[model samples]
Target: ITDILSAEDIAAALQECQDPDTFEPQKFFQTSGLSKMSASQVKDIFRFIDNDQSGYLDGDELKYFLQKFQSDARELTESETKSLMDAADNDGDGKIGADEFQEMVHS
Candidate 1:
């Protein structure tokens, strides 16, 4: 139970973690102080970030996803966004599907 966060809780966390300028979460998960989140909990966060819910995360969504795990550095530039997508896109489809996201997390 402690390892799992509710959807609402994840949403609240994202809201709190977001960077003011980019409107993207600066750190996806703060490891040390946090419990190990379940896969379902992670999926909940993914769904929330997916925004349009198209089953695939596009450029804007990709930016948000990568930024969520970003360090306290400034917001990412367009090139950084593209590089992040390239690392996760896998199939050269120009977008990340839920399966790709899961692999990124687990791997």
Candidate 2:
């Protein structure tokens, strides 16, 4: 339940994206294969990133999400994660919900 990131390093040899500071949905989905992962696959991602399984994602959860795309990637800053949260967050709840996360990935 806590600290799943270290193993994720050996997880999916997935896409390698860069610069979380730039909130580009189109570019991201294209490069990350997020849109192509299908519903089940995307949910698997959310499951891990949600960490505490609060049905929401915030804080360090965002770090896990990004690093899944690139194990060696740099962690995002506060403002950077906020930018992603803002994009993925639909209800303005200050965090990302499950459906919002799915929509964010495919959109």
By TM-score, the best candidate is 2
Q: Report the C-alpha lDDT of model 1 over 73-106, residue by residue, as the tens digit.
A: 2454676566556656789889878777666555
Structure candidate 1, residue pairs in collision: 28-68
- Give the range of the ten consecutive residues with the poorest summed lDDT in model 2: 1-10
TM-score of every candidate relative to the true structure? 0.56, 0.70
Where does candidate 2 stray beyond 4 Å? 1-25
Task: Please provide, for model 2 over 1-107, each residue's C-alpha lDDT reduced to its tens digit, 9 standing for 90 to 100.
Answer: 11322334323222333444563555655554567667877777778778788988887887666565555656766776777877788787788988998898788
lDDT of each: 0.55, 0.65
Best candidate according to lDDT = 2
Candidate 2 clashes: the total is 0
